[PDB]
C-alpha cells in the first residue's frame, strides 16, 4: 500500500494484490459545495457527463470500448468530492486508465452533447426523488447551511436547459487540478499508476479554485405532500473531518441507532419510542460530517398522527445522553458497531478504494484500518456525552415532509 | 460517508453507473393582501 | 486554376441567389446531423439565405448582383461540423464491419 | 338622473367640460387632440418622450419638488397617450380641487424640458421598448397597424421607432409642444365631487393663456418558432367615431377556441379597426380563422333576435360599468369632447342600442364584414396560420 | 423595438377609397 | 340611505337604494382559506372556481345562459378571511339574479364530474396567478410567516389537485356558509327585497359556523431560486390584526414609508424607504410598504424588487430606514402628508360601486355596523405620530419573516438582515 | 303483468350471459355521457360484465342456471344517470328552440 504524492499534488496511492479484478479510481474535490448560485447543478451534469465524448476518444469508442472488455466505469458525488472510477480484467486495465484519464484530464464538452444529456439529468433527477430520504436530507442541507453544503447533490428544475459547455469548462478547469486529486490503485502496480499520472493527471497542476466556508443557518423548510408516513430530520452543528469530536459524534450516532443490524429496537430512541407508540416508525441518528463542518441530529419516520411526540421521545432521549444517563456497557457496544461497521465498509473492494481515496484528498495520508480502531476506542464515555450536548444546544434545522398537521415546530420541539 | 452517514450515505452518496416504480413518465396566456378574484366572465385576478 | 474556379462559382450561380456553397448541399442525414449541431446563428441565417432563394425562384429573379456572393465571400460555415459527423459515421461503420 | 355634464368654453378655445356627483374624490384631466397621427416620421416618438419628460419639473416647480406636490395632497398623477389623444389626469381629493387645476396647467404649458432628464428618459424609452418586444398582443397590434394603414401617420406607431428616440432633442420636442399643444384643441374634463363654476373660475384663472388615411387591406407576418404561443389579429376597416353604426358594431362585437378570443372596435377620426385577437398554440391556429370567420360570416347572414337581445343587454352593462368611477368618467367626457364635440348622455346611447334589430345588425355587418380585404397580423409559431387567399376566401360564403 | 422597422411600400404594386373597392 | 338588519338567523342585511341604473349585490362569508386544516388544503379555491356549477334550483346550463342572456355579472373573490359573491345587473334583472346568487350560495350539489371537470381549470389558474412573482412571493410569505391558519395558501398546492372531492366541498360549505357568518349587502336595491331573499334563501344554514384555530406567528424564511431576472423578497413581522387601533397607526406607517407611487412610475421622491435606497442605489429598484391585517392578526414589512447584484444592501437601506423610524426619526409634516394620502386611498376606494359594496360588506362581516366614511377620517387623525413611531418598533423588534426569490447569490438572510 | 314481465325477461336472454338491462342499451351520445358519469366500481363492473358476455357469446355457451341475472334482480344502475342526461340534453335544446 502506497500513497505517495506526485510533485503537481496528484496523489498515487496504489496496491498489488494481484487480484483477478482490478479497480482504479480517481478522486477530485470538486462536489456540489464549489458551485454558487450561479451554476447551481454544474455538478450534476458532470457527473452524468461520463459518456461525453472527449478529446482523448468518442463517446462511442469509449463506451464500447469499455463494454467490450465487460469492464465498468461509474461516477459516485458527495458534497464535497467526486470519483471516478474503472474495474475490469487486469489484461485490459491499460486502456480503462486510457479512458478513465481521458475522461479526467481532457474534456470536450460539446454543446449538443450536453443539450442531449440535460433531458436525462430530469430524468436522474425524478429517479432519484422517487423517495422520501432523499428529498428530506437535500430539504435539511439546504435548510441547514448558507453557501457551501446547502447546495444540492441534484440540479434545480429551474437550471435545467440552462447550463451550458462554459460552465462545465469553467468548473473542470477551476476544480480538477493536480493538488485536488489522488488516483488509487487496487491490484494494479504503483508504477503504471505513475506513468499514467505523468501522460495525465500532471498537465493541470494549480490548486484550483479555493471553495468558501461553510456557514451555519438553522430553520426548518416543511414539504406537505400528503404522502402516508411523515418523514423529519432534525439536526444541528458538529465536528468537522479531522477531529477527536467527530469519533465523539460516530459513537453517540451508534449509541442512539444507526442502521438495522437485524433484518433494532434496543436503540435508545428506537427504545424510547417503542415504550409509548405502538404505531410503525423508524428513528435514527444522522451524522453527516465534511471537511468544514458538520451535522448532527435525528431521523424520524412515522404516522403523521403519532409524528408528534415520536420525534418529542426521541429528542427527549437525546436530552437523557446530554445529562450523563448512559452507561458504560452501552457505549462499549456502540464501539463494537461503530468499528464492525467500519470494517465490513472497507470489506470490499470498491469500498476498500473509495477510502483510500477519501484518505488520500482528505489527509494526504492513509491510516491502517487498526489505526482506526485505537483511535475509536480513544474517544471515551464524556466524550460521546459531550457531543450530545452540543447537539441538544446548538441551533437545530429542521426537515420535514408529509401530512404535517401534527408535526411539531423548532420552538415546540 | 457511510462511516457517518451510515443509513444515510446512500442519500448523501449520489452515484451514477456511468455507462448505462421506475419515473412515471415525469405555459398559459399571459404590496397589500393579496385578494384571489374571478368570476363568470370575471378573468382570474390577483388584486394583492 | 482558381480563377475558372471562380468563373465555375459564377456558373454555379448561387450567388446569384445568394447561396453559401453548404446552402447549396443537398440535405443528407449526414448533413442533417450537421445542420442539427450548427449553432442558431448559422442556422437562422442558413434558413432565411435559403428562403430567399426559393422566393427568388418562384419569381424567376436573381439577387442584385453587388448583392450576390462572392466566390471569396462564400464561406463554408457546415463544412467542419459535417466533417465531425462523417468521421463519426466512419468510425461506427468500421467498428461495424469488423 | 345621471350628472349632467355641463361644459364651458373659454376665449382660448379650452372647453372646460365638468360632471359633478356626490364622491368627494374627483378626477381632472387635460385630454389634448394630438398623437402619432399628427407626427411626421420625423418627430414619430415626441409625444412619448414628452409624456415622459411632463413630470420631471417645470419653472415654477422645478424637479421632484412638483411631484412632491402631489404626494403632499395624497394624489394620483397619471399619463397616456394614444394615436389620437394624449390625456394627463389627476385624481385627488374634492377640496384640493384649485392647487391640483393649477399642476395640471404647469403640465401643459410652463413645462421644462430638462436635457439632464432628456438623456435618462431616452434610456428609460429606449430600454423599455427594447423589451417592450416582450409584449406579444402590444406587437402584433403594431404590426396591424402597421399593415392596415401603410402610408397613413395613423399607422405610425406611439412610441416611435428606436431611431427617432435616440435622435430627438429639446427644441423639436418644444415644436411638437408649441404646434400641438393648441388650446382650442384641448378639454380641460373633471368628474366627481366638483362644481363646474368653481372649475371655470379656476380655468379662467390658470390655462387661460394656453396659445385623411386608407386602409391597406394588406397582410404582414413575424415568424419566431420559439415563442410558446401565437397571437393573431384579424380586422376590417371601422367606419370612425361619428358613424352611429358602430354602436350596431359593438352589439356585434357583445355577440361574439383559442386560449384566448378578443374582440375590438378601434375608432379613429373617421377610420378605424374592427375585428379579432386571439392567442393560440400553433397546431389549432387555422382552426381558430376558421371558426371565428364562420361567426362574422353568420352575423352577416343568419343574424337572430335572441342574440341580438343578448348583445344588447352586454353593451348596456358595458357602458354603464364604463361610466361608472370618476376615472373612466372624466377619461370619457375628455374623449367625448375630443372626439364628438359633446358628451353624449347614456339615454342617448340607450335610444341608439334600443333601436338596433337584427335586421339592421346583419345590414351594417354585411357592410362592413362581408367580402372585405382584411388585416392580418401574426406572430409567433405561426406556420399552419393560412395565407392571405385562404382568409380572404373565408371572408364570404359560397351559400351566401 | 420591432417599432423600428417599417413596412416596404408595394405601391408600385399597388394599383388605382370605399368608392373603388366596389369597383375593384 | 345605509339601512343594516342583522336578522335572527346571524345574517345581515344591508342595503343602500342611490337609484343606480346597474345595481350590484352582493353576499359575504366568513369562509377563507384560513378555516381549512392540512386534510383539505385547496377547498377554497375550488369552491370559489365553482361557482357556476349545477345547483338545487338552477343548473350549471341554466345559470351561465340566464346571466349572459341580461348581461350580468357573476363574480367571486376571495381572500384568506372572506369569501364575496357578487351579482350585478339592470334593476329589471336583479330578481332572478338574486335568485341565481343564492342558489350559488345556499344549495350547490357538487357533482363528481363537474369537479372532476373543473379540477384542470384549477391548474390552469394557479398557473395563470403565479405567472408574476409578486403572487409567489406574497404566498411563501405567509407560509412561513405563520403556522396553521393564515399559512394556508389561496390557491391549490400540486399534489391536492385531483385529491379534492365533492364530499369536502360539501364539508367545507355545510361547516362555514352558515348564517351567522353571513352578510348580503345591495347598492342600487330596496331593503325590503334582500330581506325577503333573506328568508326564502339563507334559511339553509343559520348556525354560528365550525370555528377557526387561532393563527400562530412561527418567523422564519423561505427562498426560492429560480433565476429570474429581478431579486423579490418581502420581510415582515406580526402587527395588529384587522379591527385593530394599532392597524390604523400602521396603516399610517406603510403610507409614511411608501404605499405605491401616486405619479405614473413615481419616483417617490417622498418616500422615505425610496429616497433611502435611491440616494445609495442608482439601479432600478421598487421598494414598498406591505401591511395585511386579519381579524386576529397582521402582517406589516417591506417588500423589494431590485436587480439580483444590489439585492442586500438596499434591503438594508430600507431596513435601516425603518429603525430610523423606530429611533422617533420623523417629522409632523410627514406624517399629515401619511395621513392624506391614507383618507384619499380610502376615499378612492369606496368611490366605485364594487368598492362600495366590497366595503360594506367587509364592515358587516367584521363589526356588524357600517362606519360612514366621515367616522373614519377622524379615526384615522386620532392616529398620532407616536402611535406610528410604536407600530414601527414592533416591526423593528418583532421575529421577522421573510420570503425571497430570484437569483439569491447576494440576498441576506435575517440573522445578517 | 308482473308474471308476463318475467317471463318475456326471461324469453329476451341477456340474463343468460349474466348482462344487467342497462349495459344492453345502445351507446348514443347521451348513454356514453351517463356512461361517462358512472362512478369507477359500477363501471367496472359493467365492463367486466360485458366482456363476460363477449367471452360466452364467442364460445357459443351460456352461463350456468344459478348464475343467471334475474328480472327483480335489476339494478338499473345507469337508469337514474341517464335520466339527468336526457333532462340536460332536452334542457338545452328547449333553449335554442
Known amino acids: 500500500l502506497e500513497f505517495t504524492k506526485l510533485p503537481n499534488g496528484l496523489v498515487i496511492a496504489s496496491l498489488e494484490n494481484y487480484a483477478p479484478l482490478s479497480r482504479i479510481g480517481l478522486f477530485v474535490k470538486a462536489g456540489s459545495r464549489y458551485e454558487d448560485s450561479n451554476n447551481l447543478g454544474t455538478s450534476h451534469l458532470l457527473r452524468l457527463a461520463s459518456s461525453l465524448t472527449t478529446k482523448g476518444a468518442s463517446s462511442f469508442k469509449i463506451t464500447r470500448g469499455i463494454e467490450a472488455v465487460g469492464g465498468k466505469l461509474s461516477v459516485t458525488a458527495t458534497r464535497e468530492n467526486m470519483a471516478y472510477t474503472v474495474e475490469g480484467i487486469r489484461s485490459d486495465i491499460e486502456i480503462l486508465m486510457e479512458f478513465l484519464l481521458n475522461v479526467t484530464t481532457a474534456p470536450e464538452f460539446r454543446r449538443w452533447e450536453v443539450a442531449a444529456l440535460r433531458s436525462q439529468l430530469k430524468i436522474d433527477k425524478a429517479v432519484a426523488f422517487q423517495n422520501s430520504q432523499t428529498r428530506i436530507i437535500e430539504n435539511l442541507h439546504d435548510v441547514a447551511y448558507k453557501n457551501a453544503l446547502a447546495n444540492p447533490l441534484y440540479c434545480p428544475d429551474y437550471r435545467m436547459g440552462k447550463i451550458t459547455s462554459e460552465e462545465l469548462h469553467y468548473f473542470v478547469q477551476n476544480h480538477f487540478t493536480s493538488a485536488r486529486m489522488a488516483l488509487v490503485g487496487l491490484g494494479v502496480s504503483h508504477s503504471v499508476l505513475k506513468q499514467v499520472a505523468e501522460q495525465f493527471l500532471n498537465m493541470r497542476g494549480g490548486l484550483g479554485l479555493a471553495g468558501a466556508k461553510a456557514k451555519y443557518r438553522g430553520g426548518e423548510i416543511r414539504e406537505q405532500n400528503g404522502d402516508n408516513l411523515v418523514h423529519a430530520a432534525i439536526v444541528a452543528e458538529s465536528a468537522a473531518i479531522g477531529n477527536a469530536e467527530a469519533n465523539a459524534f460516530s459513537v453517540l450516532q451508534h449509541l442512539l441507532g444507526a442502521g438495522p443490524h437485524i433484518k433494532n429496537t434496543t436503540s435508545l430512541l428506537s427504545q424510547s419510542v417503542a415504550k409509548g407508540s405502538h404505531q410503525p416508525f423508524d428513528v435514527s441518528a444522522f451524522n453527516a460530517s465534511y471537511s468544514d463542518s458538520g451535522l448532527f441530529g435525528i431521523y424520524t419516520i412515522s404516522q403523521a398522527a403519532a409524528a408528534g411526540e415520536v420525534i418529542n421521545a426521541a429528542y427527549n432521549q437525546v436530552k437523557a445522553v446530554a445529562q450523563g444517563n448512559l452507561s458504560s456497557a452501552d457505549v462499549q457496544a456502540a464501539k463494537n458497531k461503530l468499528k464492525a461497521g467500519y470494517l465490513m465498509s472497507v470489506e470490499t473492494s470498491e469500498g476498500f478504494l473509495s477510502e483510500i481515496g477519501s484518505q488520500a484528498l482528505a489527509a494526504g495520508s492513509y491510516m491502517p484500518p487498526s489505526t482506526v480502531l485505537q483511535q475509536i476506542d480513544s474517544v471515551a464515555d464524556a466524550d460521546v456525552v459531550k457531543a450530545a450536548k452540543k447537539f441538544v444546544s446548538g441551533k437545530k434545522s429542521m426537515a420535514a415532509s408529509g401530512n404535517l398537521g401534527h408535526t411539531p415546530f423548532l420552538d415546540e420541539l | 460517508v457511510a462511516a457517518r452517514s451510515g443509513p444515510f450515505a446512500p442519500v448523501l452518496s449520489a452515484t451514477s453507473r456511468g455507462v448505462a416504480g421506475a419515473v412515471p413518465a415525469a405555459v398559459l396566456d399571459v404590496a397589500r393582501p393579496l385578494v384571489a378574484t374571478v368570476g363568470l366572465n370575471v378573468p382570474a385576478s390577483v388584486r394583492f | ?98 | 338622473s345621471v350628472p349632467e355634464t355641463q361644459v364651458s368654453i373659454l376665449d382660448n378655445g379650452l372647453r372646460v367640460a365638468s360632471e359633478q356627483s356626490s364622491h368627494a374624490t374627483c378626477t381632472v384631466g387635460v385630454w389634448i387632440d394630438a398623437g402619432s397621427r399628427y407626427e411626421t416620421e420625423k418627430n414619430n416618438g415626441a409625444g412619448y418622450f414628452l409624456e415622459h419628460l411632463a413630470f420631471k419639473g417645470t419653472k415654477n416647480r422645478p424637479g421632484n419638488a412638483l411631484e412632491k406636490e402631489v404626494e403632499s395632497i395624497g394624489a394620483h398623477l397619471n399619463a397616456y397617450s394614444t394615436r389620437e389623444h394624449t390625456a394627463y389626469l389627476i385624481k385627488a381629493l374634492s377640496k384640493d380641487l384649485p392647487k391640483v387645476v393649477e399642476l395640471l396647467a404647469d403640465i401643459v404649458q410652463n413645462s421644462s424640458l430638462e436635457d439632464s432628464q432628456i438623456e435618462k428618459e431616452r434610456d428609460v424609452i429606449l430600454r423599455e421598448m427594447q423589451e417592450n418586444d416582450a409584449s406579444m398582443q402590444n406587437v402584433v397590434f403594431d404590426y396591424l397597424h402597421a399593415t392596415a394603414f401603410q402610408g397613413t401617420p395613423l399607422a405610425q406607431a406611439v412610441e416611435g421607432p428606436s431611431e427617432n428616440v435616440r435622435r430627438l432633442s429639446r427644441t423639436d420636442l418644444t415644436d411638437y409642444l408649441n404646434r400641438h399643444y393648441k388650446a382650442p384643441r384641448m378639454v380641460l374634463a373633471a368628474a366627481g365631487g366638483v362644481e363646474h363654476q368653481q372649475l371655470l373660475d379656476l380655468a379662467q384663472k390658470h390655462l387661460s393663456s394656453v396659445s385623411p388615411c386608407r386602409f391597406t387591406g394588406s397582410e404582414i407576418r413575424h415568424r419566431d418558432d420559439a415563442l410558446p404561443l401565437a397571437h393573431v389579429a384579424i380586422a376590417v376597416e371601422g367606419p370612425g367615431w361619428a358613424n352611429p353604426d358602430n354602436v350596431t358594431l359593438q352589439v356585434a362585437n357583445a355577440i361574439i377556441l383559442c386560449q384566448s378570443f378578443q374582440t375590438f372596435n378601434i375608432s379613429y377620426s373617421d377610420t378605424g379597426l374592427l375585428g379579432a385577437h386571439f392567442v393560440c398554440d400553433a397546431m389549432s391556429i387555422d382552426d381558430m380563422v376558421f371558426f371565428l370567420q364562420g361567426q362574422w360570416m353568420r352575423l352577416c347572414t343568419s343574424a337572430t333576435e335572441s342574440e341580438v337581445t343578448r348583445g344588447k343587454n352586454i353593451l348596456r352593462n358595458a357602458l354603464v360599468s364604463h361610466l361608472d368611477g370618476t376615472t373612466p368618467v372624466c377619461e370619457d367626457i375628455g374623449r367625448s369632447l375630443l372626439t364628438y364635440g359633446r358628451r353624449i348622455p347614456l339615454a342617448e346611447w340607450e335610444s341608439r342600442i334600443q333601436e338596433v334589430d337584427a335586421q339592421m345588425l346583419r345590414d351594417i355587418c354585411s357592410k362592413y364584414f362581408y367580402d372585405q380585404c382584411p388585416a392580418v397580423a401574426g406572430y409567433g409559431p405561426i406556420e399552419q396560420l393560412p395565407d392571405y387567399n385562404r382568409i380572404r376566401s373565408g371572408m364570404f360564403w359560397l351559400r351566401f | 423595438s420591432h417599432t423600428d422597422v417599417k413596412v416596404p411600400d408595394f405601391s408600385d404594386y399597388r394599383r388605382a377609397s370605399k368608392e373603388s373597392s366596389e369597383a375593384r
Open chain 3, 1 to 98: 486554376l482558381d480563377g475558372f474556379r471562380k468563373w465555375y462559382y459564377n456558373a454555379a450561380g448561387f450567388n446569384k441567389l445568394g447561396l453559401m456553397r453548404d446552402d447549396t448541399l443537398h440535405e443528407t442525414e449526414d448533413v442533417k446531423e450537421a445542420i442539427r449541431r450548427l449553432p442558431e446563428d448559422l442556422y437562422n441565417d442558413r434558413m432565411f439565405r435559403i428562403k430567399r432563394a426559393l422566393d427568388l425562384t418562384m419569381r424567376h429573379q436573381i439577387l442584385p448582383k453587388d448583392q450576390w456572393t462572392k466566390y471569396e465571400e462564400d464561406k463554408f460555415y457546415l463544412e467542419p461540423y459535417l466533417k465531425e459527423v462523417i468521421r463519426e459515421r466512419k468510425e461506427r461503420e468500421e467498428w461495424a464491419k469488423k
